Design a protein around this nucleic acid. Structure first.
Ligand SMILES: [Mg+2]
Ligand SMILES: [Mg+2]
Ligand SMILES: [Mg+2]
Ligand SMILES: [Mg+2]
Ligand SMILES: [Mg+2]
Ligand SMILES: [Mg+2]
Ligand SMILES: [Mg+2]
Ligand SMILES: [Mg+2]
Ligand SMILES: [Mg+2]
Ligand SMILES: [Mg+2]
Ligand SMILES: [Mg+2]
Ligand SMILES: [Mg+2]
Ligand SMILES: [Mg+2]
Ligand SMILES: [Mg+2]
Ligand SMILES: [Mg+2]
Ligand SMILES: [Mg+2]
Ligand SMILES: [Mg+2]
Ligand SMILES: [Mg+2]
Ligand SMILES: [Mg+2]
Ligand SMILES: [Mg+2]
Ligand SMILES: [Mg+2]
Ligand SMILES: [Mg+2]
Ligand SMILES: [Mg+2]
Lengths: 48, 141, 110, 117, 55, 103
RNA sequence: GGGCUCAAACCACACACCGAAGCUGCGGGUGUCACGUAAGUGACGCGGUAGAGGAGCGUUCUGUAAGCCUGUGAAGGUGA
RNA sequence: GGGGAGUGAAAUAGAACCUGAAACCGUAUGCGUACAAGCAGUGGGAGCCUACUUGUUAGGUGACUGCGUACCUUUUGUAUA
């Protein structure tokens, strides 16, 4: 046991999605929001 | 690995073809293919590996059908309305070598190499040519 | 040997000064001096001073002869610009660049 | 916390411009022009790996045609003869024989001529 | 009227292929050995042997 | 004297003492391979044409070294469609030295 | 387009050949299943926008670190 | 404003001064380029030059030639004028 020898179990921790960070990430240029419409807008949310 | 013909070591022969009684297009294909070097196993698409062709008796070339009066050669002078047309028959009477020269030029590539291959074609009106020192070998198609 | 003189911040454009520099490149210093003395260009008055300063460096720091020297290297580099404002017709303000250049003349006997 | 992009961005741009070496004008000096040229050159290079195989085969076939016609056969008749007599020499080697080993190429053509009839 | 495309540096320098300066016709006096413009009074003040401006 | 052999889906015209780069062979460095698919053996005016194989002919080579060709870059770009993938490639080869050609 | 007319047109028949990133060959990578409690074998796959899923690189800071490297040359810059 | 001298470990640390990137502008050398048509590359490829490893090599250039209408966005669809 060492401070540079400690891990969490596989699958315990994951990276968050980072949209709009280029083509290769799979979330580039729209962030998974599609093209237009309210849902693509900043603050665009449909009321419950 | 595959062989390429060096322009410095290309063997080029001289051939003389008699155009008397020959169909213009069918004689022009043999001339065009021998100016390209397509008859040589050393053929390279970017190298002029072809032979020199001397054509004699150019006015005696012939066209089938009614093409003697109907085949028309057009050119434009760059001026508005500057379209000019001449007959096969009247072009033979005026510039007979231009007939064979035109049929070969359209059959060659339209690039610097094709203009190089054209420079190896010598067309003459009489039965004699000035290149006797090159001793062309008669090439009857 | 090769000796150089440099004038930094010559108040003239590098494009204008390069026309004079192209005339004296590769010439014997005596000929180049006579060409610069009778040129109608403003750059030749400035260039001639740099050339004869290089000749003086070759004759003092290295002890040469003017008749053995030739202009081996001459080049003009762009220097610091000075930024100015010129008024135009309808309140438009236009930026004026006041160009300067670095003139380097190298003489060599070789 | 705060991450400057200068060092990493310079390394990225220099890799592209190094690939644009030898290109004309802005295609070798200006990053956003050089970037397009490096991508397009890559598209061409991928496509020309395919085209090279076609171009060389067309060159072999033309030389085999010229070599075989010097021996009284057209290309199409020689290939059919080289299948009737089970000769599996490929066109790259056949085109090398027709230029460099003409006696060997003549023997193969005669073997194809005999097989046809 | 203005360019649709920025002119390339090659094209800029090609227009300037006619901008090179010419050299004047220089002569040497014989009375003094002095360099002057051909057909001009010398900077010392001599023309074809004789002093004309006398400073 | 040259022979035509088949190696790795391709054919090569080979002579004695020639160095070749063929598709990777599962033969250790320094061992001697014997090519049996010989299509044409020519000793000079003594051309032997296999139908398809020259009967009783063997070309013997020696594995000089293994290695990878210069890297090739693979780029797939679809303009206006937000798509680009890159890929490198280095093809394995085996360098052989033709130590003998027998008719 | 050149040019073409017992065609280099049209009709019929036949035997050849060319022709793609299709198929085969040779070498390599990868996905999913199955056999493997293994290295790996077998089969079938592997164009792709929006979009979902998976696996990573790199950058700055903190710990590991009063460690390790470093004026016998750090970071940075510029070539191979 | 420079060239020397000198100071300094270092002056291309010289006061607009640590490092000193890019655009952009030059000088030098090598090769190419004035009968040639277009996204300027890519595939093939001669010659020349340089360096050693002295030609199955490395680097630079690249005649000639096949193919080839930037990118982003937005769109049913864009070389798009
Ligand atoms: Mg997607
Ligand atoms: Mg949008
Ligand atoms: Mg919509
Ligand atoms: Mg929507
Ligand atoms: Mg074409
Ligand atoms: Mg076939
Ligand atoms: Mg194919
Ligand atoms: Mg496939
Ligand atoms: Mg496989
Ligand atoms: Mg597929
Ligand atoms: Mg996919
Ligand atoms: Mg840091
Ligand atoms: Mg000291
Ligand atoms: Mg410091
Ligand atoms: Mg500084
Ligand atoms: Mg020219
Ligand atoms: Mg043009
Ligand atoms: Mg190449
Ligand atoms: Mg084209
Ligand atoms: Mg619309
Ligand atoms: Mg389109
Ligand atoms: Mg536009
Ligand atoms: Mg336009």
């Amino acid at each position: 046991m060492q401070l540079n020898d400690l891990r969490s179990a596989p699958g315990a921790r994951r990276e968050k999605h980072r949209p709009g960070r280029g083509i290769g990430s799979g979330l580039g240029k729209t962030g998974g929001r599609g093209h237009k419409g309210l849902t693509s807008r900043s603050g665009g949310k449909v009321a419950p | 690995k595959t062989y390429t013909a060096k322009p410095e070591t290309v063997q080029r022969d001289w051939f003389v073809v008699d155009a008397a009684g020959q169909t213009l297009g069918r004689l022009a294909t043999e001339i065009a293919r021998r100016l390209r070097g397509k008859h040589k196993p050393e053929y390279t698409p970017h190298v002029d590996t072809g032979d020199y062709i001397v054509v004699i008796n150019a006015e005696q070339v012939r066209v089938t059908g009614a093409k003697t009066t109907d085949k028309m050669y057009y050119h434009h002078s760059g001026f508005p309305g500057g379209i000019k047309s001449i007959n096969f028959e009247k072009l033979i009477a005026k510039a007979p070598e231009r007939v064979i020269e035109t049929a070969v030029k359209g059959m060659l590539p339209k690039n610097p190499l094709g203009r190089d291959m054209y420079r190896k074609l010598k067309v003459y009106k009489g039965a004699s040519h000035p290149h006797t020192a090159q001793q062309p070998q008669e090439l009857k198609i | 040997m090769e000796v150089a003189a440099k004038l930094s911040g010559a108040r003239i454009s590098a494009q204008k000064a390069r026309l004079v520099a192209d005339q004296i490149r590769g010439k014997k210093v005596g000929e180049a001096l006579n060409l610069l003395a009778f040129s109608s260009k403003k750059a030749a008055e400035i260039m001639k001073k740099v050339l004869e300063s290089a000749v003086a460096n070759a004759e003092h720091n290295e002890g040469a002869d003017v008749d053995d020297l030739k202009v081996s290297t001459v080049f003009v580099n762009e220097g610091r610009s000075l930024k100015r404002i010129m008024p135009r017709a309808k309140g438009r303000a236009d930026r004026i660049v006041k160009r300067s250049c670095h003139i380097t003349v190298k003489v060599a006997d070789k | 916390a705060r991450v400057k992009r200068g060092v990493i961005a310079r390394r990225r741009h220099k890799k592209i411009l190094k690939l644009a070496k030898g290109y004309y004008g802005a295609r070798s000096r200006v990053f956003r022009v050089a970037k397009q040229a490096v991508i397009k050159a890559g598209q061409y290079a991928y496509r020309d790996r395919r085209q090279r195989k076609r171009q060389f085969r067309a060159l072999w076939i033309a030389r085999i045609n010229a070599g075989a016609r010097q021996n009284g056969l057209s290309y199409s008749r020689l290939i059919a003869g080289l299948k009737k007599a089970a000769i599996e020499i490929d066109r790259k080697v056949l085109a090398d024989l027709a230029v460099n080993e003409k006696a060997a190429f003549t023997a193969i053509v005669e073997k194809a001529k005999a097989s046809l009839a | 009227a203005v360019q649709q495309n920025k002119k390339s540096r090659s094209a800029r320098d090609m227009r300037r292929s006619h901008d090179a300066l010419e050299s004047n016709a220089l002569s040497v006096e014989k009375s003094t050995g002095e360099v002057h413009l051909r057909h001009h009074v010398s900077p010392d003040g001599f023309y074809r042997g004789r002093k004309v401006v006398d400073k | 004297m040259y022979a035509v052999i088949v190696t790795g889906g391709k054919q090569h015209k080979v002579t004695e003492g020639e160095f070749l780069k063929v598709e990777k062979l599962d033969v250790a460095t320094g061992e001697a391979i014997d090519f049996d698919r010989v299509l044409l053996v020519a000793n000079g005016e003594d051309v032997k044409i296999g139908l398809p194989v020259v009967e009783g002919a063997k070309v013997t080579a020696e594995v000089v070294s293994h290695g990878r060709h210069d890297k090739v870059r693979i780029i797939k770009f679809r303009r206006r469609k937000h798509h680009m993938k890159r890929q490198g490639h280095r093809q394995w080869f085996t360098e052989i030295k033709i130590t003998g050609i027998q008719a």
